[PDB]
Design a protein around this nucleic acid. Structure first.
Ligand SMILES: [Zn+2]
Ligand SMILES: [Zn+2]
Lengths: 348, 50, 148, 148, 146, 148, 66, 50, 53, 49, 107
RNA sequence: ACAGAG
């Protein structure tokens, strides 16, 4: 007999955002029933669907055959589609506030005592990590106080027990790497993970995020299987908002206001640029202009004006970034690559 | 030309802009159409470059 | 009568639109010194890549406007400047850039960074999730092509 | 004793490229008894270090001077006499990269040793005879007390 | 509640019941209940002259008093409780390095405003018994298991 | 001295220009060198005290000295969400002809505070839509509007 | 349509301050002085009266009457 | 809107739903949260065996 | 000519590939599906010749 | 254009196909002079959060 | 109807156990964590909410030696109950004393 | 046939 039961916990269900440009626009998940009225998924999966949660409608399909289940689970699962088939780069990885919260956790400044370290580590003890023993690491500083550095609390993600056979090894450049340090740089921008302990360097977009290779989740995918790359993203998704929503992280109008060092530089740059453009105007209209090769005398003027005007944006933008303090919010969001850049900060 | 307290006995808002019709109960708006200026010499290039 | 819920689309009068994501109690909101907890926590990541400085000034002008009972204008190519509303917030005892000492409501300890409080005029859009949730097991079909 | 290394150092520089941090400073030191230069990151909030100071730095494999390697899990609560009572600042970390020097093209004896204290680094560069006992993947205790 | 015009009529019947504030926000007994730590603004160097006058305007209007010992204006902290920490001492450049704005950790200032159901000293005495009550219920389930 | 920084670190919450430092709570056993932070009922009963500084009708301000954040926050959360009162839930309507919608009117009548003392009443059981003397009250609003 | 009974943010009963707020504006106060005289400290309570529009006073013109 | 594109290569299916989406990080990366109003309508025909 | 190539603003910046100072940059914004900015860089001090986003 | 708000003073005598209203609307705290010209704050759409 | 459920770890003999406190939130959780961390026989303690719809917290307690983690949990409950009793007594004494001192003035 | 939404 056939009982047509309801959709229960564990059914393989397809899931689709409608403009489907590549094959990862439709993947298969495992369903779980929850009392509200929306489809819900982890934000690490927002990169393949290109979902953005602004009034977005996605589709669902329940397969009606056992073979339609097993072709959807083995071939089309999310744990078996972490890399794109185009160039082999990981798509399911961390996104904004999972990169910003992990960049601030792994800076060199942050220290935790035993109570807050236990409180942050104990967030991941839910689900299939409810049975595991925690393995709090030994503290770094012992004698004057007792402090865990935030990098050890991050390294709990890569190995949350004593019997977990993950050994991850990564050695790459950061984003703000200065070129001359190689694991002694002033920026602390060189990453060394050795036996899944984070020995140096903060975590950028190019180490946790969905950009490209040298991702630590891509290392876990290629060395220790699919399931160890999938658990670590769930541990990161669990652990980074607990740190970031109790540190506090905010933007303001004082985070984009120009200091006194910028307003004196910008005036001089505008005056020099407008004077050289006026001299080029007078040199075109009233005599000889040094005509650049390949262009008329009017097109030579265009390139020189675009030369003088775009020096003003560089020397105005490299003058504001020197006088911004750290713990500026757009500067933090641009150094960790989570959202924005230096063009946007220097433009607003 | 009515006062706002006389829009009350017509069940009409004073701030309703108007400019629309009522045809079989629905409210239809003749939109502003944009044309080219007639009776004017247009000197243009063809697909062939002429 | 519809009450807002998980999946209703609010806007922000600057193009920072967004759906609802979570509804938390008053006891888990972060609170100021005066007892105020926010109605709507907005994520700061929308601001760098979109460059809406206008929302960041609307918040400050509104906070400086309700503390002395004015409506500060936000007219195009003009309006009330930042240098004037920075002086109305110091006079009423607030910070001159709207950033407040904020205590976390989960742990009870203070937050490290300061948080930027103020009134922002949010408008509710017609797109509600109760008018869009849809499903079909097997139902009526077409007559010509016998498919749903 | 389980001592790896011990010499009195002397601070030559505090911030080469500027104050990149609030709690950590990238010290630059140089010894008396040998020619050892010492890059070190300390926590200057709990333990302030000035420019012309002179401290004594012992790196030990174990914190109990009976030579017992019993470290299954560090118990901070227990009170028993250890090596740390004669020192003011103690850290705990792992050696992770022994590296040959590339400055000389022939007949060199200087070897670098990198110890990471959970993110706070230490290069200990100098003669190969003084660095005996440094192995990769070995966990060491840094010990440190200022002198007059 | 409402507002009528002649001919209109309102007739209903209400049923009040008991409920806690976690369920719905019409059951909350307080307008706002909150605390803050108590400030201790301290002076690192003695501020005299006309800088005592600009120090008393970078604060709340009753915390920095200015007094004269020899016909010479010196400034001292008087009542640090009344400060709201607007942080106006950091806009002035000369005075950023003479004060240490802080908070005493183990000293709270509660401020409970009841909505009128029962007086606010009785609200705190009921709120403490609830936390005494929740610790009682799990002691009764450690004994029921074993 | 470093002892001054250790004492400021476990007893003060400083406010910098850019962030509040020393936000956490640290006095737990093993966190410090010479300090004993284990639980001691006599030290808590010796240091705790309550100073009521202002009280009138419908307001109260008082001090708690010696308690920590994780208990004062518990008291704030109980006062917000777990102290019971009496409020309207059911509204039975006979001839509402006002312009105010019946749902909106029921929602407005829900939020009126009632002067019943809630220590005298019990919870209405699951279901039981009538309710008796033990667990309900019952107001009657009846207004008819006419011309003068 | 009508003044809400409570402030949305904290919960102070604002809904009885409206008829008094108009009366204090008939005595020619500024709004920042009348809101202080009514007892509204925080700005969340102040925007309940400061931004309210009384549409029911004008919707009741179009209501049917005897 | 012919037969080949409109009704043969791509066609309307049942056992399908459509809703607004919203984030949830407390789930795994391979889970999805289906509302209960859609979980009662959608069915999977499970055969009875031992 | 090389001078006809480098009469554009940028020099002494940092590329993510070879970090060299002599550079030739570009910035675009004309795709508002890309809410982030758009840049492209040329780097030719050691004549390495990268061109990326 | 899609914000819930109020239609006019006859929004109760009016029977349309689909009408959306907000229960407690509030006028904007920061406003343009164009808002004053078109009389937007005599019947607004939105609440101050 | 059962509010407490004790889930041990995989390979630990009763000194690593996760308590599931039904119908709770951060209120009891953070206070009980504060009173358990005062116990010097506790290596690890911390809670988390399972999901914001569900009213559960999972309190994990790991002790140092071989003593089971029921005893620091029960000691945390008893010490928190005594702290709340003492706070209640001091608060009621200060309220009665303030009302007494106000009644002596203005008479 | 038109307007929306992503
Ligand atoms: Zn309010
Ligand atoms: Zn390059």
């Amino acid at each position: 007999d056939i009982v047509e039961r309801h959709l229960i916990d564990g059914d393989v269900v397809l899931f689709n955002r409608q403009p489907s440009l590549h094959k990862l626009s439709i993947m298969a998940h495992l369903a779980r029933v929850k009392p509200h009225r929306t489809f819900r998924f982890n934000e690490c999966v927002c990169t393949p669907y290109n979902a953005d949660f602004d009034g977005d409608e996605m589709n669902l399909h329940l397969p009606q055959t056992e073979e339609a289940k097993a072709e959807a689970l083995v071939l089309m699962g999310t744990k078996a589609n972490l890399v794109t088939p185009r160039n082999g780069e990981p798509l399911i990885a961390a996104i904004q506030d999972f990169l910003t919260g992990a960049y601030l956790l792994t800076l060199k400044d942050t220290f935790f005592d035993r109570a807050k370290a236990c409180q942050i580590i104990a967030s991941i003890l839910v689900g299939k990590d409810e049975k595991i023993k925690v393995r709090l690491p030994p503290p770094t500083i012992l004698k004057p106080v007792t402090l865990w550095t935030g990098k050890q609390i991050f390294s709990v993600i890569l190995r949350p027990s004593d019997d977990n056979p993950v050994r991850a090894n990564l050695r790459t450049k950061g984003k703000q790497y200065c070129g001359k340090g190689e694991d002694l740089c002033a920026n602390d921008s060189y990453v060394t993970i050795q036996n899944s302990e984070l020995m140096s360097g903060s975590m950028d977009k190019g180490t946790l995020g969905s950009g490209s290779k040298n991702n630590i989740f891509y290392i876990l995918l290629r060395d220790w299987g699919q399931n160890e790359a999938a658990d670590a993203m769930s541990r990161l998704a669990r652990l980074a908002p607990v740190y970031l929503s109790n540190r506090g992280f905010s933007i303001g109008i004082g985070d984009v206001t120009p200091g006194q060092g910028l307003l004196k530089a910008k005036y001089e740059l505008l005056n020099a640029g407008y004077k050289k453009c006026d001299e080029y105007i007078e040199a075109l209209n009233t005599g000889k202009l040094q005509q650049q090769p390949g262009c008329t005398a009017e097109e030579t003027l265009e390139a020189l004006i675009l030369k003088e005007l775009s020096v003003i944006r560089d020397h105005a933008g490299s003058a504001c970034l020197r006088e911004l303090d750290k713990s500026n919010s757009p500067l933090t969001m641009a150094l960790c690559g989570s959202k924005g850049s230096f063009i946007n900060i220097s433009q607003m | 030309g009515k006062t706002p307290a006389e829009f009350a006995k017509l069940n009409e808002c004073p701030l309703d802009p108007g400019g629309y019709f009522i045809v079989k109960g629905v409210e239809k708006v003749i939109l502003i159409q944009e044309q080219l200026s007639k009776n004017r010499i247009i000197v243009e290039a063809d697909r062939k470059g002429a | 009568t519809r009450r807002p819920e998980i999946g209703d689309k609010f806007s922000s009068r600057h193009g920072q639109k967004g759906v609802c994501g979570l509804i938390v109690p008053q006891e888990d909101m972060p609170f100021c010194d005066s007892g105020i907890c926010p109605d709507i926590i907005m994520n700061p990541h929308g601001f760098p890549s979109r460059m809406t400085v206008g929302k960041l000034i609307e918040l400050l002008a509104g906070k400086a406007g309700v503390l002395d009972g004015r409506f500060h204008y936000g007219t195009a190519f003009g309006g009330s400047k930042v240098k004037d509303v920075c002086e109305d917030l110091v006079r009423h005892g607030y910070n001159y850039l709207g950033k407040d000492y904020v205590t976390s409501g989960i742990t009870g300890e203070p937050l490290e960074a300061y948080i930027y409080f103020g009134p922002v005029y949010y408008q509710k859009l017609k797109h509600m999730v109760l008018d869009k949730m849809h499903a079909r097991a097997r139902g009526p079909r077409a007559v010509l092509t016998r498919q749903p | 004793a389980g001592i790896l290394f011990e010499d009195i150092f002397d601070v030559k520089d505090i911030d080469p490229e500027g104050k990149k941090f609030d709690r950590v400073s990238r010290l630059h030191c140089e010894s008396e008894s040998f020619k050892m230069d010492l890059i070190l990151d300390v926590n200057i909030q709990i333990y302030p270090v000035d420019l012309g100071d002179k401290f004594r730095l012992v790196i030990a494999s174990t914190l109990y001077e009976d030579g017992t390697l019993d470290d299954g899990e560090y118990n901070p609560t227990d009170d028993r006499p250890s090596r740390a009572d004669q020192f003011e600042y103690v850290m705990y970390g792992k050696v992770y990269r022994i590296e040959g020097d590339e400055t000389s093209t022939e007949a060199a004896t200087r070897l670098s040793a990198y110890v990471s204290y959970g993110g706070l680094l230490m290069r200990l560069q100098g003669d190969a005879n003084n660095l005996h006992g440094f192995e990769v993947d070995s966990r060491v205790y840094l010990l440190m007390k200022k002198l007059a | 509640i409402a507002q009528l015009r002649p001919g209109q009529e309102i007739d209903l019947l209400m049923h009040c019941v008991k409920g806690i504030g976690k369920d719905h926000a019409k059951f909350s007994p307080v307008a706002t209940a909150s605390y803050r730590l108590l400030p201790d603004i301290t002076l690192l160097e003695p501020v005299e002259g006309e800088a005592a006058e600009e120090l008393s305007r970078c604060f709340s209007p009753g915390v920095i008093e200015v007094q004269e010992v020899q016909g010479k204006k010196v400034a001292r902290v008087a009542n640090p409780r009344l400060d709201t920490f607007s942080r106006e001492i950091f806009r002035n450049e000369k005075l950023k390095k003479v004060v240490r704005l802080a908070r005493v950790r183990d000293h709270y200032i509660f401020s409970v405003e009841s909505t009128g159901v029962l007086p606010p000293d009785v609200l705190v005495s009921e709120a403490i018994k609830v936390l005494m009550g929740k610790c009682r219920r799990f002691l009764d389930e450690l004994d029921a298991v074993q | 001295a470093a002892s001054q920084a250790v004492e400021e670190m476990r007893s003060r919450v400083v406010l910098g220009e850019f962030g509040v430092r020393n936000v956490h709570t640290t006095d737990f056993p093993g966190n410090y060198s010479g300090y004993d932070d284990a639980w001691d009922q006599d030290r808590f009963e010796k240091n705790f005290r309550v100073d009521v500084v202002h009280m009138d009708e419908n307001s109260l301000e008082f001090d708690m000295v010696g308690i920590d954040a994780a208990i004062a926050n518990a008291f704030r959360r109980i006062l917000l969400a777990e102290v019971p009162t009496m409020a309207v839930e059911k509204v039975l309507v006979y001839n509402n002809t006002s312009i105010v919608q019946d749902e909106i009117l029921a929602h407005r009548l829900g939020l009126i505070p009632i002067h019943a003392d809630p220590r005298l009443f019990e919870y209405r059981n699951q279901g039981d839509e009538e309710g008796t003397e033990i667990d309900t009250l019952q107001f009657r609003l009846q207004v008819r509007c006419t011309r003068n | 349509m009508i003044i809400p009974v409570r402030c949305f943010t904290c919960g102070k009963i604002v809904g009885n301050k409206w008829e008094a707020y108009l009366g204090l504006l008939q005595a020619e106060y500024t709004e920042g002085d009348a809101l202080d005289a009514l007892g509204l400290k925080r700005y969340c309570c102040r925007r309940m009266l400061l931004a309210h529009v009384d549409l029911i006073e004008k919707l009741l013109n179009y209501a049917p009457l005897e | 809107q012919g037969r080949f594109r409109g009704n043969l290569s791509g066609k309307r299916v049942d056992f399908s739903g459509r809703t607004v989406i919203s984030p949830d990080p407390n789930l795994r990366i391979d889970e999805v949260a289906v509302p209960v109003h859609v979980a009662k309508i959608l069915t999977f025909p499970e055969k009875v065996n031992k | 000519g090389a001078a006809a190539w480098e009469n554009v603003d940028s020099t002494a910046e940092s590329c993510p590939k070879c970090e060299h100072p002599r550079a030739y940059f570009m910035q675009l914004q004309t795709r508002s599906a890309d809410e982030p900015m758009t840049t492209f860089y040329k780097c030719c001090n050691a004549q390495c010749g990268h061109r990326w986003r | 254009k899609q914000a819930m708000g109020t239609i006019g003073y006859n929004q109760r005598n009016r029977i349309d196909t689909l009408m959306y209203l907000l229960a407690y609307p509030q006028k904007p705290m920061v406003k343009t002079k164009t808002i004053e010209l078109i009389e937007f704050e005599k019947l607004p759409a939105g609440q101050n959060a | 109807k059962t509010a407490l459920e004790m889930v041990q770890a995989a390979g630990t003999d009763r000194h690593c156990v996760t308590f599931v406190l039904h119908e709770e939130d951060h209120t009891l959780g953070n206070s009980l964590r504060y009173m358990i961390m005062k116990n010097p026989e506790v290596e690890f303690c911390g809670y988390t909410t399972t999901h914001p719809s569900e009213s559960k917290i999972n309190l994990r307690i790991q002790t140092r030696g071989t003593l089971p983690a029921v005893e620091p949990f029960q000691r945390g409950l008893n010490e928190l109950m005594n702290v709340c009793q003492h706070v209640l007594d001091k608060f009621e004494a200060s309220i009665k004393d303030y009302k007494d001192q106000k009644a002596s003035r203005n008479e």
